[PDB]
Design an enzyme around this catalytic site. Structure first.
Site, PDB file in Angstrom:
ATOM      1  N   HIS A  36      42.931  43.449  51.453  1.00  9.43           N
ATOM      2  CA  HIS A  36      43.556  44.874  51.091  1.00  9.43           C
ATOM      3  C   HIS A  36      44.237  45.183  52.320  1.00  9.43           C
ATOM      4  CE1 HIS A  36      40.767  45.005  47.486  1.00  9.43           C
ATOM      5  NE2 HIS A  36      42.063  45.424  46.958  1.00  9.43           N
ATOM      6  N   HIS A  79      49.359  42.688  51.368  1.00 10.93           N
ATOM      7  CA  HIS A  79      48.953  42.898  50.097  1.00 10.93           C
ATOM      8  C   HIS A  79      50.027  44.000  49.657  1.00 10.93           C
ATOM      9  CE1 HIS A  79      47.018  43.667  46.494  1.00 10.93           C
ATOM     10  NE2 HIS A  79      46.787  45.054  46.689  1.00 10.93           N
ATOM     11  N   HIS A  98      49.628  51.736  48.068  1.00  9.31           N
ATOM     12  CA  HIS A  98      48.394  52.127  46.934  1.00  9.31           C
ATOM     13  C   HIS A  98      47.297  51.747  47.455  1.00  9.31           C
ATOM     14  CE1 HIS A  98      48.769  47.967  46.722  1.00  9.31           C
ATOM     15  NE2 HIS A  98      47.813  47.817  45.598  1.00  9.31           N
ATOM     16  N   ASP A  99      47.311  50.909  48.825  1.00 10.76           N
ATOM     17  CA  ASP A  99      45.954  50.719  49.173  1.00 10.76           C
ATOM     18  C   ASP A  99      45.949  51.033  50.681  1.00 10.76           C
ATOM     19  OD1 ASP A  99      44.119  49.334  47.168  1.00 10.76           O
ATOM     20  OD2 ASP A  99      45.459  47.631  47.552  1.00 10.76           O
ATOM     21  N   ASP A 133      49.578  44.829  41.259  1.00  5.31           N
ATOM     22  CA  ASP A 133      48.345  44.673  41.827  1.00  5.31           C
ATOM     23  C   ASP A 133      47.602  43.485  41.928  1.00  5.31           C
ATOM     24  OD1 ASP A 133      46.545  45.784  43.727  1.00  5.31           O
ATOM     25  OD2 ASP A 133      45.590  47.256  42.290  1.00  5.31           O
ATOM     26  N   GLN A 181      36.705  33.190  37.888  1.00  8.84           N
ATOM     27  CA  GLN A 181      38.095  33.369  37.886  1.00  8.84           C
ATOM     28  C   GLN A 181      38.648  33.500  36.327  1.00  8.84           C
ATOM     29  OE1 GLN A 181      40.800  34.183  40.191  1.00  8.84           O
ATOM     30  NE2 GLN A 181      38.824  35.039  40.644  1.00  8.84           N
TER      31      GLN A 181
HETATM   32  C1  LIG Z   1      42.101  37.168  41.425  1.00  4.11           C
HETATM   33  C2  LIG Z   1      41.823  38.573  41.638  1.00  4.11           C
HETATM   34  N1  LIG Z   1      42.752  39.687  42.033  1.00  4.11           N
HETATM   35  C3  LIG Z   1      42.123  40.908  41.578  1.00  4.11           C
HETATM   36  C4  LIG Z   1      40.701  41.127  41.575  1.00  4.11           C
HETATM   37  C5  LIG Z   1      40.479  42.716  41.641  1.00  4.11           C
HETATM   38  N2  LIG Z   1      39.883  40.126  41.196  1.00  4.11           N
HETATM   39  N3  LIG Z   1      38.566  40.168  41.094  1.00  4.11           N
HETATM   40  C6  LIG Z   1      38.173  38.763  40.920  1.00  4.11           C
HETATM   41  C7  LIG Z   1      36.709  38.283  40.782  1.00  4.11           C
HETATM   42  C8  LIG Z   1      36.580  37.735  39.603  1.00  4.11           C
HETATM   43  C9  LIG Z   1      35.082  37.333  39.498  1.00  4.11           C
HETATM   44  N4  LIG Z   1      34.642  36.398  40.211  1.00  4.11           N
HETATM   45  C10 LIG Z   1      33.270  36.583  39.601  1.00  4.11           C
HETATM   46  N5  LIG Z   1      32.016  35.885  39.979  1.00  4.11           N
HETATM   47  C11 LIG Z   1      31.212  35.793  38.968  1.00  4.11           C
HETATM   48  C12 LIG Z   1      29.938  34.532  39.331  1.00  4.11           C
HETATM   49  C13 LIG Z   1      29.682  34.476  40.533  1.00  4.11           C
HETATM   50  C14 LIG Z   1      30.812  34.217  41.389  1.00  4.11           C
HETATM   51  C15 LIG Z   1      31.993  34.820  40.739  1.00  4.11           C
HETATM   52  N6  LIG Z   1      33.158  37.407  38.539  1.00  4.11           N
HETATM   53  N7  LIG Z   1      34.558  38.137  38.303  1.00  4.11           N
HETATM   54  C16 LIG Z   1      34.980  39.103  37.612  1.00  4.11           C
HETATM   55  N8  LIG Z   1      39.272  38.107  41.181  1.00  4.11           N
HETATM   56  C17 LIG Z   1      40.408  38.884  41.412  1.00  4.11           C
HETATM   57 MG   LIG Z   2      43.166  49.432  45.447  1.00  2.00          MG
HETATM   58 ZN   LIG Z   3      45.950  46.696  45.620  1.00  2.00          ZN
END
Ligand SMILES: Cc1ncc(C)n2nc(CCc3nc(N4CCCCC4)nn3C)nc12
Ligand SMILES: [Mg+2]
Ligand SMILES: [Zn+2]
EC number: 3.1.4.17
Length: 312
Positions: free
Chosen positions: A67, A71, A105-106, A216, A268
């Site tokens: 952040h 970014h 924005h951040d 974003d 992911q």
């Molecule tokens: C590329 C990207 N851009 C923006 C943002 C806000 N995000 N947020 C994520 C997190 C995605 C995610 N990883 C996991 N875990 C659940 C099991 C354990 C390990 C992993 N859950 N989730 C939802 N990736 C992004």
């Molecule tokens: Mg933000």
């Molecule tokens: Zn952002």
């Protein structure tokens, strides 16, 4: 007068959605001015005020893994690409306000989620009960605009000034991903029942909010090595938050637990299917020329699938 220019490879590739702003920090201001100039005009902002605004913005981004100032400029370049591929849908004020919104924005992010601030009982969580950091980012924006010699909107009328600060506020609030889900559902239904109307100001607001989420999240629309290396930064924040949750005596959600490193590929996939792909799908329905973002996201989803199959 004085046109900003870039080297030929940057001059050409900055127009594409998948452009990466590069590791030369000192070129990011020039890259942003370049983008304001082409998407808005050499007349939108007094150069001296704009330069002084950009530099105070940079100073109020912190040295956190994700952040950060890179970014901000990355999210502004995606907005530049959307604006340039949809020339005639956006007003003069929207053109002006959205690149500024994206850069800001951040602002003053600490690397922690709204939820961590609420559990720690951070003072900002009492000033702002929902969209805590995003109300803070808009507040930091108005602060910088009000410093001596930083009012890039000085040329605007009182009502044009008020409208632009209102576009920026809504655009920044919309980057709270908790608000994206219902926003994209409303837009999906409006598009499908043909009620979507871009002369309706509350419809424009929703479309701009979706553009914001799209800009974003744009790391998922890059060349795979960019996507993959940015994902390490993203988790480097989440895992530090997870450590801080454990320090408060709370088991963090799996996303934030560095002990569940192995589940990142699957996390992911969930994120592409639940957030990214739907985002760029609705965006592409509403603004067809944004299709390269949906096409890139889909390519990166299949790269994460290859990782899970052990081919990557
Ligand atoms: C590329 C990207 N851009 C923006 C943002 C806000 N995000 N947020 C994520 C997190 C995605 C995610 N990883 C996991 N875990 C659940 C099991 C354990 C390990 C992993 N859950 N989730 C939802 N990736 C992004
Ligand atoms: Mg933000
Ligand atoms: Zn952002």
């Amino acid at each position: 007068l004085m046109q900003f220019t870039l080297p030929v490879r940057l001059c050409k590739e900055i127009e594409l959605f998948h452009f990466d702003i590069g590791p030369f920090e000192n070129m990011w201001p020039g890259i942003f001015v370049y983008m304001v100039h082409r998407s808005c005009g050499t007349s939108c902002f007094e150069l001296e005020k704009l330069c002084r605004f950009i530099m105070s913005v940079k100073k109020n981004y912190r040295r956190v893994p994700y952040h950060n100032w890179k970014h901000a400029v990355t999210v502004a370049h995606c907005m530049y690409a959307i604006l340039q591929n949809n020339h005639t849908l956006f007003t003069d004020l929207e053109r002006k306000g959205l690149l500024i919104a994206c850069l800001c924005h951040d602002l003053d992010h600490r690397g922690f989620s709204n939820s961590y601030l609420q559990k720690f009982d951070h003072p900002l969580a009492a000033l702002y009960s929902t969209s805590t950091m995003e109300q803070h980012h808009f507040s930091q924006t108005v602060s910088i605009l009000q410093l001596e010699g930083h009012n890039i909107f000085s040329t605007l009328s009182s009502s044009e000034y008020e409208q632009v600060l209102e576009i920026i506020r809504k655009a920044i609030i919309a980057t709270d991903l908790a608000l994206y889900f219902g926003n994209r559902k409303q837009l999906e239904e409006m598009y499908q029942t043909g009620s979507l109307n871009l002369n309706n100001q509350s419809h424009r607001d929703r479309v701009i909010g979706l553009m914001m989420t799209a800009c974003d999240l744009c790391s998922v629309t890059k060349l795979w090595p960019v996507t993959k290396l940015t994902a390490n930064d993203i988790y480097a924040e989440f895992w530090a938050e997870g450590d801080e949750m454990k320090k408060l005596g709370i088991q963090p959600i799996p996303m934030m637990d560095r002990d569940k490193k192995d589940e990142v590929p699957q996390g992911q996939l969930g994120f592409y299917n639940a957030v990214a792909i739907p985002c760029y799908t609705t965006l592409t329905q509403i603004l067809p020329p944004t299709e390269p973002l949906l096409k890139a996201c889909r390519d990166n989803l299949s790269q994460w699938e290859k990782v899970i199959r052990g081919e990557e």
